[PDB]
């Protein structure tokens, strides 16, 4: 019932479940935290910005890797108007045989890609599932830099 | 071990084990005292 809202002693003394709920919803309101100065505020915001950009780059790297690994980017290059892009494969134990058959695309059940990443990456000059892997590797390196 | 075994190795791992340990840690942390 203590020590969770480390940034707020008023919440940490709450004997109810409201402390847990308000601890989540006030975690990023740095200006309202206990023992707070402006320098610490700007420094924490700066570090949070770095972590956020790292998260964005990791998300993009994950999209690239999953298109390279479980997608049909190379097949879509040769026939972009008939082949439907694949986002990533599906492994869900709750599937029946009918669901597996219906979601089956090429070798495994997979989700069609509605993000338009296939067309975007094709336009900027990507033609191989090894070009996407290089992008994922580089973006994970950039995320490490930002962290 | 082929690459197609990775989903069956990772999806249960992440989607069940990570919730369990994360719940353990979060409950322990939010139920601490001083």
């Amino acid at each position: 019932v203590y020590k969770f809202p480390k940034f707020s002693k008023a919440l940490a003394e709450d004997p109810s479940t409201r402390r847990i709920w308000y601890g989540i919803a006030t975690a990023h309101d740095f200006e309202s935290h206990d023992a707070m100065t402006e320098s610490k505020l700007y420094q924490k915001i700066f570090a949070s910005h770095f972590g956020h950009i790292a998260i964005i780059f990791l998300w993009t790297a994950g999209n690239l890797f999953h298109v390279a690994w479980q997608g049909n980017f190379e097949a879509w290059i040769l026939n972009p108007l008939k082949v439907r892009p694949i986002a990533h494969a599906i492994w869900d134990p709750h599937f029946g045989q009918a669901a597996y058959k219906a979601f089956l695309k090429t070798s495994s059940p997979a989700n069609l890609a509605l993000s338009g990443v296939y067309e975007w990456w094709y336009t900027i000059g990507m033609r191989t599932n090894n070009d996407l892997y290089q992008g994922s590797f580089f973006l994970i390196l950039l995320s490490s830099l930002l962290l | 071990m082929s690459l197609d075994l990775l989903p069956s190795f990772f999806v249960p791992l992440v989607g069940l084990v990570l919730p369990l340990f994360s719940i353990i840690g979060l409950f322990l942390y939010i139920e601490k005292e001083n």
């Binding site: 924490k44 790292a54 590797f137 994970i140 | -």
Partner: peptide
Amino acid sequence: MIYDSQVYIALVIAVVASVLAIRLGATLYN
């Protein structure tokens, strides 16, 4: 089709990015 080595080293590099993330997470304090 990417190889096992390609996926494995990407997983290893992802682990390194994870240790860098907790270091940033712990440095942003409890």
